[PDB]
């Protein structure tokens, strides 16, 4: 067997527990947009590869056609409701 | 790819040379943007088989019209035999 891919820690905070999250809410290779999505939701709110990955995917996967101003900020509400 | 089909290319290339270099290079200037003439333009009508549009651009080995390559002058099938047998300089298999 082989281990899971090792990703460099999120440069902005130098922490590994945030890069994996921003890579899956990402769409179509648009990482640059991803920070515009989640950092606005994060910087302004103020085996380990099975259950954390699956549960956190469920959070991202319900923001496609909810029909409001912008799901960019709706997911901020969703995580605010979650938190 | 017929001797009958091939013969009309020689008929057309050798005939498109004169009227293009003698009449079309002189008369088509009038019909271009120069600011045309109804009766004058009738001179272009009279010859038919002298035009760059009359091209088939067939292979130079077997007279095959399809799959041409202007760099080599041949078709798909003939360049493979004429190159990889070693008869085209500098051409090898591309691997990278």
């Amino acid at each position: 067997v082989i281990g899971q891919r090792k990703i460099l820690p999120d440069p902005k905070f130098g922490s590994e527990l945030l890069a994996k999250f921003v890579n899956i809410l990402m769409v179509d290779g648009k990482k640059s947009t991803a920070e515009s999505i989640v950092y606005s939701a994060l910087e302004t709110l103020a085996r380990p590869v099975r259950r954390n990955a699956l549960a956190m995917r469920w959070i991202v996967e319900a923001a496609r056609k909810r029909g409001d101003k912008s799901m960019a900020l709706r997911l901020a509400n969703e995580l605010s409701d979650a938190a | 790819a017929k001797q009958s089909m091939k013969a009309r290319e020689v008929k057309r290339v050798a005939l498109a040379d004169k009227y293009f270099a003698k009449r079309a290079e002189l008369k088509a200037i009038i019909s271009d943007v120069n600011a045309r003439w109804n009766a004058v333009l009738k001179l272009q009508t009279l010859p038919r088989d002298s035009s760059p549009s009359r091209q088939r651009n067939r292979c130079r080995q077997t007279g095959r019209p399809h799959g041409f390559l202007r760099k080599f002058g041949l078709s798909r099938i003939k360049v493979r035999e004429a190159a990889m047998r070693g008869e085209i300089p500098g051409l090898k298999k591309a691997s990278w």
Binding site: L8, P11, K12, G14, K31, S32, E35 | -
Partner: protein, 127 residues
Amino acid sequence: NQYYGTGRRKSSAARVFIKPGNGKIVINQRSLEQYFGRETARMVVRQPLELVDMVEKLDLYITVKGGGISGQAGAIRHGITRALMEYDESLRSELRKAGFVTRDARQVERKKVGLRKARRRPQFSKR
């Protein structure tokens, strides 16, 4: 006085010159805030100079051309490192353990015959 390290990543090719003092970074005759900064390409260039004693004691001079925003940012990061191990060899191990020493060899795949994106075979849904 300049200590130099090239750095290069994914068709980018940087040139980094390290000088002592004033901790200022100049990239393509421009500061890094206006040219790279405020995206994830602001902190990433300074990751090596920040894990080691902070920039203010090291003057930079960077002339990078080619590649992309991230490729140049990775190239510059590699450029600063190569320059600063030539500066001092005491921090030889610190960066390699941090992982900035190694140069990435992951090029982009060449587009190949028969595949739609060179690793995405065309759809053959029905038979």
